[PDB]
Amino acid sequence: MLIPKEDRKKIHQYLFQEGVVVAKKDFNQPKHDEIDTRNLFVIKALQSLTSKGYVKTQFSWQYYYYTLTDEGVEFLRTELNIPEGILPLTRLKNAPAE
Amino acid sequence: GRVRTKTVKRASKVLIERFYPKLTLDFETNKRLTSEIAVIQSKRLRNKIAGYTTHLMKRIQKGPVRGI
């Protein structure tokens, strides 16, 4: 897929920092509401990450539920060049409730 | 047709073998009596059972009936 380098980035600082992403299955939608790029880019960008075991993909009712594996956080540590500067948001260990 | 079933025929004649002195020849009285005698889940079945017990009671006074 031909994604601009900058738009591929924005997809990565949303799939990191809230490491789960939801995208409706419509390829021609101009903007996925929460990542300022084409909606089709979000589906195909994370399809590559799920192809190399960096995101789980779930499909239900024409919607994609992408979640970032713990194995994928280390890779974005090295590509976004981030340091181990805290947890995305879903790993901040807010702990469950009883 | 108006043929009563087995859940009402055997249930009606068990009432007679155990509670005959308290029973009667009145359907209205029997219907009220059976609400404290049997635990019947539905009102229509209570009336159905009491309606057949009264018929059997009305028949016993004319002689002994078979199965009770």
Partner: protein
């Protein structure tokens, strides 16, 4: 936006149908049983019932945290507006949803049907169910497909009580040779029902004779 009473309650139901199916595909491996949508002020409590509450609230409750965020982002919910809780199934043997996935997880492990099938027949009865019947349909190392019923105990089939004392679960089993369809029909004991009727409609419980006392001719006991 502005939505009618008729169109809102149907939408609330549709929200329930889509959310529940999301958990069935995602939490299939954790014996997902059902979901309860408890509306409340300033929060939307949702109780998910699963056989295994370790697969959900695992590794510092990460999955449940990473799972509640996927629902706020798809339904445009405020991050504080929803709270998700994970609850253990009380009677694992009486929940057909857990039993069908577990059976699926055994069939998918290559286990023979009888050791697997009798594993749900006896597990249902062991939990105290009045009856249980399992139908397994599909193809197994043979081109022609077959179905087998495994009954046990007492089962009712017709009328409303089937809507009260029977829960059902259908699961498609993806095998290398085709699809296996399993139906796990479990009839709970109506005596254990705690809100609706506690017995079948034709169950008549006649009381016992309280008589055979001795009556003495005619005194009166004063005080």
């Amino acid at each position: 936006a502005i939505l009618s009473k008729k169109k809102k309650l149907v939408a609330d139901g549709v929200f329930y149908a889509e959310l529940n199916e999301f958990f069935t595909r995602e939490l299939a491996e954790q014996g997902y049983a059902g979901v309860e949508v408890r509306k409340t002020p300033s929060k939307l409590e949702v109780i998910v019932k699963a056989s295994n509450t370790q697969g959900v609230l695992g590794e510092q409750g990460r999955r449940i945290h990473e799972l509640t965020s996927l629902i706020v982002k798809r339904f445009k919910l405020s991050p504080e507006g929803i709270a998700i809780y994970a609850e253990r199934v009380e009677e694992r043997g009486l929940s057909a949803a857990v039993q069908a996935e577990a059976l699926k997880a055994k069939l998918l492990s290559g286990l023979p049907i009888r050791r697997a099938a009798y594993g749900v027949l006896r597990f249902a009865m062991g939990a105290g169910a009045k009856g249980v019947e399992v139908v397994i349909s599909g193809k197994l190392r043979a081109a022609r497909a077959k179905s087998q019923k495994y009954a046990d105990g007492f089962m009712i089939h017709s009328g409303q009580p089937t809507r009260d004392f029977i829960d059902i679960a259908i699961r498609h089993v993806l095998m290398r040779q085709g699809v296996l369809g399993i139906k796990v029909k479990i009839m709970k004991d109506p005596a254990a029902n705690r809100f609706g009727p506690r017995a079948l409609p034709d169950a008549v419980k006649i009381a016992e004779a309280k008589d055979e006392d001795e009556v003495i001719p005619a005194p009166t006991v004063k005080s």
